[PDB]
Design a protein around this ligand. Structure first.
Ligand SMILES: CCCCCCCC/C=C\CCCCCCCCOC(=O)[C@H](O)CO
Ligand SMILES: CCCCCCCC/C=C\CCCCCCCCOC(=O)[C@H](O)CO
Ligand SMILES: CCCCCCCC/C=C\CCCCCCCCOC(=O)[C@H](O)CO
Ligand SMILES: CCCCCCCC/C=C\CCCCCCCCOC(=O)[C@H](O)CO
Ligand SMILES: CCCCCCCC/C=C\CCCCCCCCOC(=O)[C@H](O)CO
Ligand SMILES: CCCCCCCC/C=C\CCCCCCCCOC(=O)[C@H](O)CO
Ligand SMILES: CCCCCCCC/C=C\CCCCCCCCOC(=O)[C@H](O)CO
Ligand SMILES: CCCCCCCC/C=C\CCCCCCCCOC(=O)[C@H](O)CO
Ligand SMILES: CCCCCCCC/C=C\CCCCCCCCOC(=O)[C@H](O)CO
Lengths: 296, 295
């Protein structure tokens, strides 16, 4: 009846019930660890020369944006679901444009120069892109959605609340892996716009579980530490070999498209203000497209 | 009766009872926050071009060493206090030599080229060096019956997670120049330290009342402060030319305070005083030996 046994049993249960999601998670997990090892072994042997500095400031900004919203949960009055859906809807739009125009596109240009700009450029991004979708489909499924029992769920809840921002951080690290501000700033800022609404929501979600407002906020602030930590994971997976960057550019794109469509867009519609949320999605997408078009 | 109010009152209480420890902490905190902003503003305006990469892999090693020791708390049999005193005494010896020979020395050479190798070199490390002692004295002093017993398990786990941030900033400061002869000795010294305290942190949480697995899970997560702290360490070393030698001193003072006032008392508490002391000698001597070999 230890939560370790509870996790192993539930993980056994879902692996039996969803074998392809489970197999697709095993493969993606394997790739991430392999590109990470490769990127560490490359570093240990000299010769790496990645751009960690910009990724570290990028991850830190995200820490602050999460905290910012986390602290909005102590304010007086309230923020209606109506305003949150627009805030979350706008961010989801900038996040869609960013993984299209700041990660999938440059990742083709990346893989273009190594292996050829044809179907060979397209199939290297795809290896990442499908791998990122499968990665976050498995984490969605192998993550949770009566005194001793009720407590362990607060544990299983707080831990996926803490970790869930690691991918958003790894996308940040991958955009900045070449130190290119035109690749990085659009993505990093788009995740920072998203972090404010999710910071508030993460915090209020914890208060709903039963933590007093202050620990609930302190846990919400600690959630943003995964984006500095993830950015470190992102730079290392981009860097074992020449093909690791475009694969990773693809994998971050896949991870971020899955999170928006299958996780955040349902949050906007669940509150019921469907029209205002999707018009934001258009506004977020269009303006992000405009800014990448301007800076080129 | 909220835990926020309980912390605010106790911080008011300790600031009244220890005014110089309190002002000495206000001052040190101030410098670190200032050297960080300065170091970030430097990057945002271009011109920084430091390589965090070396500090990042160093911080990652520390994560693993803490995790390593944390997971030893699931083992069969047990590890005697006698063996733990030797492990911790040896590490404290390597940490003293390292902040002497890998942080204070190079920090003098640093301030040497900037302002001169006389008393001008010595007073720039010292500004930092006293600032590191003052920083870790204040953190020692300002960190710690149903509703009451729980808020201390909260305040306990919270300082348990945070306590490695300074050990992490020392790592970032050794590597702030990407010089492996400064960096490797220091970070390896803390990684040797990280294994024994990882075991202790895990067992200490289990003694508080967390089941063995969450106690181990919290212990593993404590090691994340050394990657994160190392980022803080790179930013304070880098606002201006004098920020590096100050920070070399500031980590040295912070690390000397932790060894002498925190790690050495732990080794004696279990009672095997002699073995801890010759270990500390062995750790110091070999570390000196390796710095002399590496030059
Ligand atoms: C576009 C498509 C491009 C290629 C994508 C697909 C690539 C590999 C598919 C791997 C499927 C492996 C079969 C294992 C089923 C595992 O489950 C099972 O076998 C059942 O339990 C049977 O008892
Ligand atoms: C738009 C396309 C939609 C298609 C979605 C399905 C994607 C497939 C998901 C995961 C496949 C992972 C690729 C490696 C498979 C090798 C399985 C080889 O077999 C194995 O390794 C098993 O252990 C066999 O038991
Ligand atoms: C930023 C997030 C990155 C985190 C990466 C780690 C998270 C999840 C870790 C592991 C997933 C393991 C799933 C086990 C499936 C085994 C059945 C099927 O096993 C298999 O079929 C094997 O392929 C054997 O051939
Ligand atoms: C509990 C709180 C823990 C805090 C967690 C977040 C840590 C991040 C905080 C500050 C990061 C500043 C380090 C970057 C300094 C060098 C800029 C890098 O710029 C560069 O040097 C580039 O190479 C330029 O080319
Ligand atoms: C308690 C720990 C500290 C937490 C505080 C977090 C500080 C927030 C840090 C940076 C905000 C802006 C970062 C932008 C990404 C890097 C752009 C770099 O861009 C540039 O280089 C210039 O635009 C031109 O060079
Ligand atoms: C390695 C290269 C891989 C090649 C491409 C494979 C990528 C897989 C692409 C898309 C899979 C995402 C759709 C997820 C379907 C199940 C979610 C649905 O979950 C649900 O919510 C239920 O249906 C109930 O509503
Ligand atoms: C909860 C788990 C989340 C993960 C927590 C973070 C701990 C692991 C952090 C980083 C692992 C990879 C280090 C960076 C690899 C890039 C080498 C650095 O690049 C370089 O080597 C430079 O170019 C010079 O050496
Ligand atoms: C890596 C760990 C670094 C963490 C640093 C942040 C933690 C420090 C937190 C709070 C500082 C304590 C303030 C004490 C007030 C004394 C009033 C006296 O105030 C004053 O009169 C003037 O400010 C003197 O300068
Ligand atoms: C051993 C731990 C290792 C490192 C831990 C670093 C994380 C930081 C841990 C605790 C934070 C201490 C800050 C307390 C501020 C007290 C000022 C309060 O003063 C006041 O509020 C009065 O107004 C003063 O007059």
């Amino acid at each position: 009846s230890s939560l370790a046994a509870d996790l192993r049993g539930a993980w056994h249960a879902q692996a039996q019930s969803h074998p392809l999601i489970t197999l697709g998670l095993a493969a993606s997990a394997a790739g991430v660890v392999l590109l990470l090892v490769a990127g560490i072994v490359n570093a240990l042997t000299g010769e790496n020369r990645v751009h960690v500095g910009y990724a570290v400031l990028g991850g830190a900004a995200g820490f602050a944006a999460t905290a910012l919203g986390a602290l909005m949960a102590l304010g007086l009055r309230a923020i209606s679901a109506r305003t949150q859906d627009a805030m979350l809807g706008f961010a989801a739009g900038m996040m869609l444009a960013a993984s299209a125009f700041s990660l999938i596109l440059p990742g083709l240009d990346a893989a273009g120069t190594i292996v050829g700009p044809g179907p060979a450029a397209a199939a290297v991004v795809a290896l990442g892109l499908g791998l990122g979708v499968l990665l976050m489909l498995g984490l969605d499924y192998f993550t949770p959605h009566p005194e001793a029992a009720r407590v362990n769920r607060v544990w299983l809840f707080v831990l996926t609340i803490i970790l869930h921002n690691l991918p958003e951080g790894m996308a940040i690290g991958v955009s900045f892996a070449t130190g290119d501000l035109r690749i990085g700033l659009p993505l990093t800022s788009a995740i920072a716009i998203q972090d404010v609404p999710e910071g508030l929501a993460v915090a209020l979600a914890l208060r709903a579980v039963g933590l007093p407002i202050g620990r609930a906020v302190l846990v919400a602030v600690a959630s943003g530490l995964m984006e500095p930590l993830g950015a470190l994971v992102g730079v290392g997976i981009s860097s074992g070999f020449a093909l690791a960057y475009p694969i990773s550019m693809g994998l971050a794109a896949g991870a971020m498209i899955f999170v928006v469509s299958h996780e955040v867009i349902p949050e906007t519609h669940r509150n019921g203000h469907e029209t205002t949320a999707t018009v934001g999605l258009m506004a977020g997408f269009a303006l992000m497209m405009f800014l990448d078009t301007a800076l080129g």
